[PDB]
């Protein structure tokens, strides 16, 4: 078929693939610095502002927390309702997706040269 | 061991990982703008031309359709036999792989800032 | 919680996601040219030197071998103990992760424009 079901506008280029949660919500970062949560019907569930572009896909944790790195150097942990659970500061931009260990530890590399292991 | 089984030429740099189909076919996009379907013995099954470089890996749907974004701005849906199923225009280059939802909807972000949801 | 469990210093930016192996070891490539194997407690298990930045995530085979491409043009197969199993030369930088077929063949694209199939 190949027809448009909908389009959803962000402010700048979307450089990484979206991620779909179990409840169908689609998550996508934008170069406009926001993480968007989009309902299956194309309406905005919420958006979360980081300070600079989001270059890599978000990752969804076992408990539903959404993790995303920003060019503002922080790794963000976002609750399913769109409020910030926490943010973790690294020295430079985070250009790749975090990885979650089986025991819940969040691993993320930074342009500051370190691999960080973070408690969930 | 580590010896070469074969090598397959494309015109320019290959910037994303190949993807392997159920039948063993290896799919890979090239900066020469073509999507290549390569047999396990390294001969070309087919190639599909897009207008500009392909920067992200293709994605294979459950029915075997091969989806690939192009810097020419279109998302291409290609049948296993190399014929075009459809192509979907966005405003600018598609730099990341599409993602397929459970109901089959295809999601793809574009450098034009939109997330597109496309009916398969 | 959101506090640092530990951090691990490499010489330059880490551009790709880390990869957790089947024994829990964390593997990550650095722009300083090394692949690092990091224990869960944050101590270095070993590091493996390539000639130039590693831009993509390593891939781990079912037998424990770790594969990683380098901007020095080589694909490296590394044993779990950090010794080189073999090294495979391509003409130019390898910018994306390899992929392993069901028969064990290693597939990898290169900036020299070829898709290589390598015997394991």
CB-nearest partner of C2 from A86, A109, A114: A86
- Distance from the Cα of C31 to chain A's closest Cα (Å) equals 8
For residues A39 and B60, give the distance between their C-alpha atoms in angstroms, rounded to a whole number.
24
CB-nearest partner of A115 from C12, C38, C40: C38
**Three-state SS across chain B?**
CCCEEEEEECCCCCCCCCEECCCCCEEEECCCCEEEEECCCCCEEEEEECCCCCCCCCEECCCCCEEEECCCCEEEEECCCCCEEEEEECCCCCCCCCEECCCCCEEEECCCCEEEEECC
Experimental method for this entry?
A: X-ray
| Chain B residues bordering chain C (beta-carbon distance below 8 Å) | 1-20, 24, 26, 28, 30-32, 36, 38, 40, 42, 57
Q: Chain A to chain C, count of Cβ pairs less than 8 Å apart? A: 87
Give strand ranges (E) for chain C: 4-9, 19-20, 26-29, 34-38, 44-49, 59-60, 66-69, 74-78, 84-89, 99-100, 106-109, 114-118
- Distance from the Cα of C16 to chain A's closest Cα (Å) equals 5
How far lies C113's CA from each of A19, A45, B8, B94, in Å? 30, 43, 8, 21
For residues A112 and A118, give the distance between their C-alpha atoms in angstroms, rounded to a whole number.
16
Q: Where are the domains of chain B?
A: 1-120
How far lies B98's CA from each of A66, B35, B52, B60, B69, in Å? 19, 15, 17, 10, 7
Instruction: List the chains bordering chain A where 3 or more Cβ pairs fall under 8 Å.
Output: B, C
For residues A67 and A45, give the distance between their C-alpha atoms in angstroms, rounded to a whole number.
17
**Three-state SS across C21-40?**
CCCCCEEEECCCCEEEEECC
Q: Could you give the 3-state DSSP secondary structure of residue A90?
A: coil
A62, A90, C10, C6: which is closest to A76 by C-alpha?
A: A90
Query: Phi and psi dihedrals of A24, rounded to 5?
Result: 90, -15
For residues B49 and B64, give the distance between their C-alpha atoms in angstroms, rounded to a whole number.
19
Residue to mutate among B1, B6, B7, with most C CBs inside 10 A, is B7
Find how far residue C26's CA is from the centre of its chain.
11
Chain A contact set for B117 (CB, 8 A): 4-8, 26, 42
**C62-65 contact pairs (CB < 8 A, 24+):** C64/C21, C64/C22, C64/C23, C65/C120
Work out whether strand A34-38 and strand A44-49 pair parallel, antiparallel, or are unpaired. Answer: antiparallel
- Distance from the Cα of A85 to chain C's closest Cα (Å) equals 8
Chain B contact set for C103 (CB, 8 A): 40
Instruction: List the chains bordering chain C where 3 or more Cβ pairs fall under 8 Å.
Output: A, B
Per-residue buried b or exposed e for C83-120, using 16+ beta carbons within 10 Å of the residue's own CB: eeebebebeebbbbbbbbeeeebbbbbbbbbbbbbbeb
Name beta bridge partners: A26.
Answer: A20, A38
Chain C contact set for B59 (CB, 8 A): none
Dihedral (Cα; C25, C81, B16, A78), 10-degree rounding: 10
Q: Dihedral sign, CA of C24, A62, C35, C5?
A: negative
C101, C102, C99, C49: which is closest to C74 by C-alpha?
A: C49
CA atoms within 13 A on the CB side of C98: 31
C-beta of residue B8 within 8 angstroms of C-beta of residue C114: yes
C-beta of residue B55 within 8 angstroms of C-beta of residue B73: no
C-beta of residue B34 within 8 angstroms of C-beta of residue B50: yes
Q: What is the CA radius of gyration of chain B?
A: 14
Q: Are the Cβ atoms of A10 and B111 closer than 8 angstroms?
A: no
Residue B68: partners with Cβ closer than 8 Å, 6 or more residues away: B27, B29, B35, B48, B50, B54, B56, B58, B59, B75, B76, B78
Which chain C residue has the Cα nearest residue A94? C15
Q: Could you give the 3-state DSSP secondary structure of residue A83?
A: coil
For residues C25 and C22, give the distance between their C-alpha atoms in angstroms, rounded to a whole number.
7
C-beta of residue B50 within 8 angstroms of C-beta of residue B84: no
For residues A112 and A90, give the distance between their C-alpha atoms in angstroms, rounded to a whole number.
7
- Of chain C, the end-to-end C-alpha distance in Å amounts to 43
Q: Are the Cβ atoms of A5 and B77 closer than 8 angstroms?
A: no
Work out whether strand C106-109 and strand C99-100 pair parallel, antiparallel, or are unpaired. Answer: antiparallel
CA atoms within 13 A on the CB side of B59: 22
**Three-state SS across A20-70?**
ECCCCCEEEECCCCEEEEECCCCCEEEEEECCCCCCCCCEECCCCCEEEEC
For residues B96 and B109, give the distance between their C-alpha atoms in angstroms, rounded to a whole number.
7
Left if phi > 0, otherwise alpha if psi is -120 to 50, otherwise beta: which for C42?
A: left
């Amino acid at each position: 078929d190949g027809t448009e079901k909908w389009r959803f506008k962000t402010g700048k280029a979307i450089e990484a693939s979206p991620v779909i949660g179990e409840d169908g919500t689609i998550y996508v970062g934008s170069n406009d610095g926001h993480l968007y949560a989009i309902n299956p019907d194309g309406t905005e569930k919420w958006r979360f502002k980081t300070g600079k572009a989001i270059e890599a896909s978000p990752v969804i944790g076992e408990d539903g927390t959404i993790y995303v790195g920003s060019n503002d150097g922080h790794l963000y942990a976002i609750n399913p309702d769109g409020t910030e659970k926490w943010r973790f500061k690294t020295g430079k931009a985070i250009e790749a997706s975090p990885v979650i260990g089986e025991d819940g530890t969040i691993y993320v590399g930074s342009n500051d040269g370190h691999l960080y292991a973070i408690n969930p």
